[PDB]
Design a protein around this ligand. Structure first.
Ligand SMILES: Nc1nc(=O)c2c([nH]1)NC[C@@H](CNc1ccc(C(=O)N[C@@H](CCC(=O)O)C(=O)O)cc1)N2C=O
Ligand SMILES: Nc1nc(=O)c2c([nH]1)NC[C@@H](CNc1ccc(C(=O)N[C@@H](CCC(=O)O)C(=O)O)cc1)N2C=O
Ligand SMILES: Nc1nc2c(ncn2[C@@H]2O[C@H](COP(=O)(O)OP(=O)(O)O)[C@@H](O)[C@H]2O)c(=O)[nH]1
Ligand SMILES: Nc1nc2c(ncn2[C@@H]2O[C@H](COP(=O)(O)OP(=O)(O)O)[C@@H](O)[C@H]2O)c(=O)[nH]1
Ligand SMILES: [Zn+2]
Ligand SMILES: [Zn+2]
Ligand SMILES: [Zn+2]
Ligand SMILES: [Zn+2]
Lengths: 442, 442
């Protein structure tokens, strides 16, 4: 019953862990029992100094014996100078699938409880090292699948999003203290400037409208695009992948945990993470239909076009190295298509045009409303519009000139809604949900 | 052309890395350029001390700009007090699939070269911090898929295997200096005790024979068993897995990188890692044939038995909760089977008997010749027998009583063969092959 209050000492595995990959694996412990557990588990030879921000060498051993568990490194982060602001220790094990398990188990046995998803980064927020926008954005950092998705996440982490919103809430709180002091103290204050505070709302709701503009970029860099490739057999679907993948793959270096099929399908086009799925995919945001220009449009092309035409579509005209130049514009295709691209897959050319076509079909809303790499998410934008509505709800009731009693209801609503975002005023259901979608160890 | 000589400064990703899992990911740099690269890349606020074994907080930034790449922790390991004995730095990034890539790239740009498989742990050996048996066993540690496979690997790491072999090589070198001084200095030394040194060989070849006994345990804990489950549809194959898996799974806690299907199939029986494959599997060491005791043996049972009978086989008689007690011994099955087990899969009982049957079918050679958790591998055992052969080759030529000239050839061979194991005398082809089967970052 009810988190929001730090009571125990928590431990979890802090790194990805796969059976025969990766040199090292961490186990992180945080809480008032942290150093006590490192104390009773880590054997550090030849009197090394046990201070904060000090690396130690030794052996994690006794499970009630002295039976050595790993040759490990110990990290100490004491004081409020840690991730969670609590005392933090880290065991740096070899870690296949065995050592970390063994060490974690020894932690639970020494009075640590198993941390829940996001619980480390919650305790960070709970001790006022982070606000919600920051907490949220570190999940965005490790969740990023493109260089600019990270850039956007890093901006969130850095506080670039927490600073404006907390600034705006202060403003509403200030023009709330003005109205609330007049309503209570007889004279002792000259009357309100009825149209100066319609100009203050016009300032605030303007800034929060600039933020709500980024919302689209946010959804794209976070979720990315789900792209299906359809076509007939021997048209060049697999050939299309290779060409596109080689110049657009998200993984350019060999990466221990990840399997080649995710390295192959997870790529990036003009900043947007693009994920290639494997007539079936209505789960796709955009579909690439591939026909063979060497034989031109066929009946098999028509039918699978009939299945996918309701979804955003790009016709990929493959094997143009086989048609001669003068006859390219002569090639037949159903007239409703507005996005056609000629590619020579085996020759690895055309993917530059494919990119332009994919970016084009996306920038019909506003992908050219982008300013910098700061972008809010769904939940943040949800609370911002609701703060905007409630804010111009007051922007109406002061032109009607009701008494100060019927101004204060809606202003509070705006302050509370902005309080949701940074987290000075959040329901615990909202709070639990935020951290529940974090992975374990985070 | 030719490793075996440290020239550059190397960098690689030291942890497993999967797209949306694991709180942190390391990038390790080692060499004379290590600290210089941390210098020019890690922004550490408010003058923190830059000493060895010190944890630093800050921001990995400029790619020729100042553009922040991650909020990271820096680890410094200077002097010969490191993994590789060189100067070692570690960047501890957030790491999804983006941050570590970004940081590694910035390392290559600052004069680091990308480390090759095992190259860190080779440089450790190359600077005499480890012998080959130890180097080999750290790959065994992260490669282990059972608690005792780790225990065995840790023994190797600890030096429990390097100590005896280097001891034995010294002995051969000593009884080589005795013979070689007599052959060269006129008198100046009383003649050899011809049957004292047949007793010395009887001591050495005895100890190296005790080691060669473990070879079997070694192969089992390293490779483990590949077990296939065959049967007809609706017999209880999937039901068998669950029951067996729940009390024998190798992963008892939630582990970021690994997928449920590897958590499900990778289990352990009496110490041996057992991997469950998915009429087809001759790639299996042991097969479990499952029939349905409720309907008894069928014709479909017979045919798939005809496919798998040449492989070691255990008949799993499933659904015994449906046959009544007196009629169990009455159930018909082909007479050549010597290993039958009754299981009630849905009721989760029988897996204790299955274990006993699986251990039984394996301990026909010598799995009860085991003493402790020290066990040599294929390559080590290969060089040991060859040292043994060459050692009793001398154990013959001194009973024939040839001159001291025709003793020295074979003794050297034994010393050289034992020199292969710890690594004081290795071909570079052997050396390259050893580290080539390590994963990257290791
Ligand atoms: N090994 C490792 N463990 C982790 O828990 C971890 C990494 N690496 N890499 C990134 C880091 C997240 N970043 C942080 C954030 C704050 C502090 C910290 O000590 N708190 C102080 C700063 C110290 C100072 O100013 O001197 C603070 O008050 O913010 C440390 C690391 N992180 C988690 O993913
Ligand atoms: N973060 C991290 N990085 C690593 O490279 C690493 C881990 N963890 N965990 C286990 C460790 C392998 N173990 C070692 C071995 C030797 C030293 C070392 O500093 N060498 C000295 C010991 C220092 C002393 O005696 O005070 C030596 O001479 O052996 C450090 C870690 N290892 C890699 O997988
Ligand atoms: N000339 C030419 N041949 C191609 C091109 N793309 C694919 N092919 C050939 O067409 C065959 C079928 O391609 P494939 O990728 O397997 O099509 P899929 O079955 O839809 O995956 C392959 O043998 C390729 O060599 C192209 O752009 N030009
Ligand atoms: N009474 C009984 N029923 C079982 C047992 N094992 C499996 N079943 C039932 O038999 C059905 C088929 O089992 P299943 O695991 O799917 O067999 P598979 O098709 O070979 O994978 C399931 O619906 C189970 O409920 C058992 O030990 N006892
Ligand atoms: Zn194909
Ligand atoms: Zn036509
Ligand atoms: Zn089945
Ligand atoms: Zn019969």
């Amino acid at each position: 019953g009810s988190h929001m209050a730090i009571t125990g000492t928590i431990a979890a595995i802090a790194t990805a862990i796969v059976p025969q990959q990766g040199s090292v694996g961490i186990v992180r412990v945080s809480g008032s029992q942290a150093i006590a557990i490192a104390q009773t588990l880590f054997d550090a030879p030849g009197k090394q100094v046990w201070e904060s921000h000090r690396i130690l060498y030794g052996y994690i051993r006794h499970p009630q014996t002295r039976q050595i568990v790993d040759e490990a490194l110990l990290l100490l982060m004491k004081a409020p100078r840690s991730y969670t602001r609590e005392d933090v220790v880290e065991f740096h094990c070899h870690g296949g699938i065995i050592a970390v398990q063994q060490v974690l188990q020894l932690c639970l046995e020494s009075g640590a409880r198993l941390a829940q998803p996001g619980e480390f980064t919650l305790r960070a927020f709970l001790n006022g090292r982070l606000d919600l926008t920051q907490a949220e954005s570190i999940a965005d950092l490790v969740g990023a699948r493109s260089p600019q998705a990270a850039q956007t996440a890093l901006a969130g982490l850095q506080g670039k999003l927490a600073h404006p919103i907390r600034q705006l809430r202060a403003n509403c709180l200030d023009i709330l203290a003005e109205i609330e002091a007049r309503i209570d103290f007889e004279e002792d204050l000259p009357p309100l400037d009825d149209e100066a505070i319609i100009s203050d709302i016009e300032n605030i709701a303007a800034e929060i409208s600039q933020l709500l503009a980024t919302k689209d970029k946010g959804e794209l860099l976070r979720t990315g695009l789900k792209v299906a490739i359809v076509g007939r057999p021997n048209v060049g679907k697999s050939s299309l992948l290779n060409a596109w993948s080689q110049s657009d793959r998200a993984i350019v270096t060999d990466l221990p945990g990840t399997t080649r099929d995710v390295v192959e399908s997870q790529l990036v086009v003009g900043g947007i993470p693009v994920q290639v799925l494997d007539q079936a995919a209505n789960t796709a945001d955009l579909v690439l239909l591939t026909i063979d220009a060497a034989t031109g449009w066929t009946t098999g092309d028509q039918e699978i076009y009939e299945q996918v035409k309701h979804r955003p579509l790009i016709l990929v005209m493959n094997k143009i190295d086989l048609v001669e130049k003068q006859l390219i514009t002569s090639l037949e295709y159903p007239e409703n298509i507005t996005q056609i691209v000629h590619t020579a897959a085996a020759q690895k050319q055309g993917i530059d045009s494919l990119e332009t076509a994919i970016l084009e079909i996306v920038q019909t809303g506003k992908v050219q409303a982008a300013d910098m790499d700061l972008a809010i998410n769904q939940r943040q934008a949800a609370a911002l519009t609701q703060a905007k509505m409630s804010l111009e709800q007051v922007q109406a009731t002061i032109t009607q000139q009701l008494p100060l009693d019927f101004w204060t209801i809606d202003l509070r609503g705006a302050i509370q809604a902005l309080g949701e975002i940074t987290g000075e005023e959040v329901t615990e259901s909202v709070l639990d949900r935020i951290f529940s979608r974090f992975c374990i160890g985070k």
